[PDB]
Structure formats: structure tokens, C-alpha cells
């Protein structure tokens, strides 16, 4: 029992972290097999960042200008290429600590662990969700660029995120490992609008099921609702409209607790319309949306 | 910017995790140098746990009865000894992945990362605080015993906790790595009282300083207080009485923000007496006490 915002063990990702320096800019790289992945803004100076022409900037760089350091060993760069907003530096040495891995593009509302790094060194790990508006509310400082987001299925690391920037509002934006930004964001020092965000309804319901499993039950009521009635309340409160697909993925949780998904929806409706009344659920005084139904199943059953 | 409940990168601890089986009970062991540490209840059966005589139980066990498995390799047990509530199994092989490490006994209110494991496999990592009453509010299931709590200073892992049990109230109890329980707890299947808990005042103030650093400022007021006036409010709200030692460790945060500690105390006093008024601080609707002043400095400055 007990429910925590648990991150994946970051070990397989720590062995992949390197420091990449180009000119006077230092950031984090991800060394997998004989390739190092990093944000393409490693080639820019402060003045370049206002409106960079990356193709022009990269033309003035040679293999020897990219300094890649794996803690104490220096890697030899034998090739470089830009793919979208990432640079791929071919090294002459395959990383001995390369785990089994995949590059995946995650969906909004999905969750992942972030290994925050500075100068190629791991500082900490935390679990986060990709917001419906494609931003993440992380904890990133200058030097954290190139830190990655990932998920792990047994021995396979699915890299889903690489950190690129902090928006003027303090929220974060990055790309998948092919360098495509999540969201409308561009790697330029300009004010950029992040879309209207919503709360991830399915995750809040999964989190309500986790609370029932662990003993927090005061919010359960004698009511029920329909998807259409619930979605009118979700609309008023800026919650993602609930679909049958969401109801289907909540099935294992509904089955284990014996509380039908629309009955749980009715508890969420009363919580939205009346607040928590100065009470807590799994140590929180607000409705948590950073646990997917999958995350609740995994934690509640003890999957390693 | 941004503030997250960040855990230490768990890599150096994952390389130390092993599975320990004795008879029909399986749990987690910690392999450091040529010694494996695990809870002593690995030698008990369900019937034994009601009132175990550990010395008697251990006498019927030989080196060959302790099965220690490091993933795929089997370790050869050449000695066994009980120290308080832990068993130390001497193996003939020093763990090649042993990091630089220390065994430390932490103080109540201090924080650490927990690497939850099942059958010697790491499932996830999360940050937690040792409650003033010596319990932890973790996320532990059957099989998690022997999972450890730790802190990391550059290349040194300070092991501070080993998980032993779940109290009837769903809260957790364990020992330091010398097998001494934190708190009055005993490794027996009996109902055991955990003392009255309090909120870690110094950590809540550190967390208020983190909120100021990251932009959440609405709670700052035109008031001030004294340690004596503040402690009367801390008494009414079951907060740990603030001392000059706590005021001294908040110094770096007070210095960086320019908000005197007693001025921050006055903000906390108004928050305790008036609640959050349906607002949030660093994404929380309650007063967070799981970040020490040290944790705030480290995260806010980017220490790896
Ligand atoms: C300062 C900072 C803090 N946290 N995370 C990232 C940070 N760095 C940047 O955002 C630098 C940068 C500027 C403009 C565009 C891009 Cl792609 C990158
Ligand atoms: C079931 C469980 C869940 N979470 N964490 C630990 C768990 N196991 C136990 O507490 C087993 C046990 C019983 C009595 C005394 C001791 Cl020392 C240990």
C-alpha cells in the first residue's frame, strides 16, 4: 500500500549521458550505439539564438569542433548531421553501456521519467506528464538541455523526450529523439504561445482508482452519470472530454475494485463541482493527473 | 525554473540489488563489497512472523540455505550473521558494481530516495521524508522488503534506510543498514503504535523559498513574527517548533531571496491560519514538507 509519483530506475539512462560542447556552449548528449544525440542549439551562441539559421551555423562546424566527453573519456567524432532540431554525432566507439532501446513519440497525457543532467552528469529523476498542450512542467536550469524523458518495459528503454527550452512562462518544451518538437514550438529565443491546457481526465480517474485501492474512499458516492453528462462537467472545468477509449483503458481498474467507470466519473463530477472540502486524496489536496491507468496498474501490482 | 520532488539517480543503487531467498520467503538484498544485507525476516515463514525468535530461527539455517541471486549469477554464501534486524551474508565475490558508499543513520525530517525493488529487480524510484515519528509514507507491496533508501554526494551513496514492514495503518517502517529500526518498531506481525506525527516546519519554509525563487509569490505578506509567536501557531497546527538551528540552515535561502526567515515564517503563519484559499504553490494545494533547505539549494542551483 501507499501511492507515490514514482519514476523509472534511471540506471540504463545514466550510462548513456555525455557532455557535448561546441565553441563555448555546453549541454547534454545521449550516447546510444555509435551515435550521440543532442539539441541542435549546442552550435549557437547567445546572439545566434534570437533568430538562428541552423543550416548556416552548422556549415561552419567540423567533426573536431564537437567535443563529446563521457565522464573521463573523450569520444572521437567521425560524422555529424542535423535531423530536425537534433544533432547526430557519429562517434568511432559504440557505447558499452547502451541498453536495449527504442525511439518513441508519446501522446499528450502520457507520462515519463526525466533524468535531469548538467554538463553530462545526472542530477535527479522525476516523473512527469506530457501536458495536453505538449509542454512539460519540469525542473530545468541552464545546462539541462539534452536531458531526456523515457519509459522502460523490462529491459527496453523507450526514449520519448529531449529537453530543448524554457518558455517565457517557465514551462518546458522539447522534441522526440528524431528532433521533432512536441507542440508548435521552435528552437528560437522568441515568445511562443503554448495552447490552452486541460486536465487529463483519464489519469485523474486512474488516480481515483489508486486512492480506492489504497484506502482513500471518502469521495465515493451513491451516484452515477453518463459520458454525455460527465463531459458537460469536464467542459465547464477544462477537463479532457472522456471517450469510450478512455473508459476501455480504465477497465482493469474498474474490474479490480468493482466500481464501474461511470460511477467513478460521478465521484469526479462531485469533486469538480464541490472541491475537496479541505480533505486529501493520496496526500494531495488537488486532483492529480500525472498517473496514467497503466502507471496505476504497474504500481498497484509491483511490476519491475 | 520549475520545482519537482526529485529523487537521486538510482543507477549506483540498482547495481547493488540482489534477490535473497531462504526456504520459501523471497525478498531484496543489498550487495556491497563481499557482503549482502537484507531484513532478518527472510528466515521466517508466515506462522513465524506472529512472535519470531530470530536467534532460534537463524540457528536452523546454514550458509547453503540462503540463496542469493544477482540477476542471472548465483552468489556463493560463505558466512552469515545477524546484526540487530538485518542479516549479513558474506559472499565469496565482491560486487564489481559497488559504488563508494557509507552507512548513515538519518534524522527525522531528513529526506531520501527509495529504490523500490521486487525479487531483486528495481521497479521505481521516489523521494520521501523520514516522518518526525520515524515512519515513511512509501509505496511498498509484498516482496519490497529489503528495498533501500539513500542519498548521494557526488560519487558517494549514503545508505540510510532498508524497508522492513507495513504497519496496520499502511505506513512504512524500516531500519538503518546496521539493522536498528527507526522508531519504536519491532519486526513482528503485531499492531504497533507510531507516535503522533508533526509537519516538518523547516522543510515547509524551504519549500516556500523554492516557490518564491520560481515565481509563486502570492503568499508573501507585509507581516513579520518572532520565533515565540510563530511557535504558538506551529503548536496549534501540529508543526515542529522552529528553532534557531532551523533558522540557521534556512540562511542560504533567506540570503538569495532577500526575505528574512521570520518574514517567511509570517507568510507560513497566515497560510496556516487562513488556508490556501483555493490556490496552489508549486502545483500543490497543501503545505509541502518533503524538501529540506539543502534539497531546495541543490535543485535551485543544479548540483549533480
Ligand atoms: C534557461 C533554461 C532553463 N531551463 N531549461 C532550458 C533553458 N535554456 C534555454 O531555453 C536555452 C534556449 C533558448 C532559446 C531557445 C532554445 Cl531551443 C533554447
Ligand atoms: C505486505 C507488505 C507491504 N508493504 N511493505 C511490506 C510488507 N510486508 C511486511 O510487512 C511483512 C512483515 C510482516 C511483519 C513484520 C515484518 Cl518485519 C514484515
Contact A165, A229 (CB under 8 A): no
Are residues A244 and A161 located together in one domain of the fold? no
CA distance B132 to B201: 11
Cell readout for A195 is 495552447
- Candidates B113, B123, B289, partner chain A, best to mutate (most A CBs within 10 A): B123
Q: Do B94 and B175 sit in the same domain of this protein?
A: no
* d(C-alpha B116, C-alpha B122), whole Å: 6
Cα-based distances in Å from B205 to B160, B220, B278: 24, 12, 20
Q: A63 with A106, same domain?
A: no
User: Pairing state of beta strands A25-32 and A17-22?
Assistant: antiparallel
Cα–Cα distance for residue pair B263/B250, rounded to 1 Å: 12
Distance CA A245, CA A228 (A): 14
Asked whether B82 and B35 are in contact (CB, 8 A), the reply is: no
Q: Whose CA is nearest to atom 2 of ligand 1?
A: A142
Method for this entry: X-ray
End position of a domain, from candidates B162, B197, B232 = B197
Task: Say if residue B59 is in the same domain as residue B186.
Answer: no
Residue B175 grid cell: 531500519
Which chain B residues are closer than 8 Å to A276 by Cβ? 285
Domain closes at, from A163, A197, A231: A197
Place of cell 540455505: B65
Q: Residues A92, A165: one domain?
A: no
In this structure, are B7 and B136 located in the same domain? yes
CB atoms within 10 A of CB B33: 12
DSSP-derived secondary structure for chain A: -----PBPP-HHHHTTEEEEEETTEEEEEEEETTEEEEEGGGG--TTGGGS--HHHHHHT--GGGEEEEETTEEEPEEEEEEETTEEEEEESS--TTPPEEEE-PPPTT-EEEEEEEETTEEEEEEEEE--TTS-B-----TT-TT-EEEEEETTEEEEEEEEEEE-TTS-EEEE-TTSPBSSS--SSSS--PPPPP-B-HHHHHHHHHHHHHTT--TT--S----HHHHHHHHHHTTBPPP-HHHHHHTHHHHHHHT--HHHHHHHHHHHHHH--TT--BTTBSS---S--HHHHHHHHHT--
Residue B203 sits in the same domain as residue B70: no
Nearest to A3 by CA among B122, B124, B36, B78: B124
> Has B246 been annotated as catalytic?
no
CA-based nearest residue to B31, from B162, B153, B138, B135: B162
Closest atom of ligand 1 to CA, residue A166:
10
Q: What is the CATH number of the domain that holds A65?
A: 2.40.10.10
- Longest alpha-carbon distance in chain A: 69
Beta carbons within 10 angstroms of residue B81's beta carbon: 11
Domain range enclosing B50: 15-99
| Annotated active-site residue in B85, B145, B160, B300 | B145
**Active site residue ranges of A:** 41, 145
Q: Are residues A1 and A118 in the same domain?
A: yes
- What does the alpha-carbon distance between residue B147 and residue A119 come to, in Å, rounded to a whole number? 30
Is some CB atom of chain B closer than 8 A to the CB atom of A194? Answer: no
Q: Which chain B residues are within 8 Å of A117, Cβ to Cβ?
A: 304
A96 in contact with B, Cβ within 8 Å = no
Same-domain check for residues A151 and A46:
no
Residues A189, A205 within the same domain: no
Which is nearest to A148 in space by CA: A107, A190, A104, A82? A104
Of B197, B195, B144, residue with least CA distance to B166: B144
CATH number at residue A207: 1.10.1840.10
Shared domain for A8 and A123, answered yes or no, is yes
The C-alpha cell that represents B91 in the structure block: 559472499
3-state secondary structure chain B: CCCCCCECCCHHHHCCEEEEEECCEEEEEEEECCEEEEEHHHHCCCCHHHCCCHHHHHHCCCHHHEEEEECCEEECEEEEEEECCEEEEEECCCCCCCCEEEECCCCCCCEEEEEEEECCEEEEEEEEECCCCCCECCCCCCCCCCCEEEEEECCEEEEEEEEEEECCCCCEEEECCCCCECCCCCCCCCCCCCCCCCECHHHHHHHHHHHHHCCCCCCCCCCCCCHHHHHHHHHHCCECCCCHHHHHHCHHHHHHHCCCHHHHHHHHHHHHHHCCCCCCECCECCCCCCCCHHHHHHHHHCCC
CA distance A127 to chain B (A): 8
Q: Which of B197, B221, B237 is the last residue of a domain?
A: B197
| Ligand 1 touching residue A110 (CB < 6 A) | no
Q: CA–CA separation, A162 vs A39, rounded Å?
A: 8
Residue pair A170/B214 in contact (Cβ under 8 Å)? The answer is yes
Least Cα distance to A144 among A165, A113, A130, A127 occurs for A165
Residue B125 has its nearest CB partner, among A9, A170, A303, at: A9
**Measuring CA to CA, which residue among A166, A149, A167 is closest to residue A158?**
A149
Distance CA A257, CA A104 (A): 32
Same domain, B235 and B129: no
As given in the structure block, the three cell numbers for residue A255 are 474490474
CA distance B1 to B74: 46
Measured over the CA atoms of residue B41, residue B45, residue B50 and residue B55, the dihedral's sign is negative
Domain count, chain A: 3
Among the listed residues B102, B119, B54, B50, the one whose alpha carbon sits nearest the alpha carbon of residue B80? B54
Convert A231-296 into a string of H (helix), E (strand) and C (coil).
Answer: HHHHHHCCECCCCHHHHHHCHHHHHHHCCCHHHHHHHHHHHHHHCCCCCCECCECCCCCCCCHHHH
Rg of chain B over CA atoms, in angstroms?
21
Picking from B6, B9, B10 by the largest number of A CB atoms within 10 A of its own CB, the best residue to mutate is B9
Closest ligand relative to B54 C-alpha: 2
Amino acid at each position: 500500500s501507499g501511492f507515490r509519483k514514482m519514476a523509472f530506475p534511471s540506471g540504463k539512462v545514466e550510462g548513456c549521458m555525455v557532455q557535448v560542447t561546441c565553441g563555448t556552449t555546453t549541454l547534454n548528449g545521449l550516447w546510444l550505439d555509435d551515435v550521440v544525440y543532442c539539441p541542435r542549439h549546442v552550435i549557437c551562441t547567445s546572439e545566434d539564438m534570437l533568430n538562428p539559421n541552423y543550416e548556416d551555423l552548422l556549415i561552419r562546424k567540423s567533426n573536431h569542433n564537437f567535443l563529446v566527453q563521457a565522464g573521463n573519456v573523450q569520444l572521437r567524432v567521425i560524422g555529424h548531421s542535423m535531423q530536425n532540431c537534433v544533432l547526430k554525432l557519429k562517434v568511432d566507439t559504440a557505447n558499452p553501456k547502451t541498453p536495449k532501446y527504442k525511439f518513441v513519440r508519446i501522446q499528450p497525457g502520457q507520462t515519463f521519467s526525466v533524468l535531469a543532467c548538467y554538463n553530462g552528469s545526472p542530477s535527479g529523476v522525476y516523473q512527469c506528464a506530457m501536458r495536453p498542450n505538449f509542454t512539460i512542467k519540469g525542473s530545468f536550469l541552464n545546462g539541462s538541455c539534452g536531458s531526456v524523458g523515457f519509459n522502460i518495459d523490462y529491459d527496453c528503454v523507450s526514449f520519448c523526450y529531449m529537453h530543448h527550452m524554457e518558455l517565457p512562462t517557465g514551462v518546458h518544451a522539447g522534441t522526440d529523439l528524431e528532433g521533432n518538437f512536441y507542440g508548435p514550438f521552435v528552437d528560437r529565443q522568441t515568445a511562443q504561445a503554448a495552447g490552452t491546457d486541460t486536465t487529463i481526465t483519464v489519469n485523474v480517474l486512474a488516480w481515483l482508482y489508486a486512492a480506492v485501492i489504497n484506502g482513500d474512499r471518502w469521495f465515493l458516492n451513491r451516484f452515477t452519470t453518463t459520458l454525455n453528462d460527465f463531459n458537460l462537467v469536464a467542459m465547464k472545468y477544462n477537463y479532457e472530454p472522456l471517450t469510450q477509449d478512455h473508459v476501455d483503458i480504465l477497465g482493469p481498474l474498474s474490474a479490480q475494485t468493482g466500481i464501474a467507470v461511470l460511477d467513478m466519473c460521478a465521484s469526479l463530477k462531485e469533486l469538480l463541482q464541490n472541491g475537496m472540502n479541505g480533505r486529501t486524496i493520496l496526500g494531495s489536496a488537488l486532483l492529480e493527473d500525472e498517473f496514467t491507468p497503466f502507471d496505476v496498474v504497474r504500481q498497484c501490482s509491483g511490476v519491475t
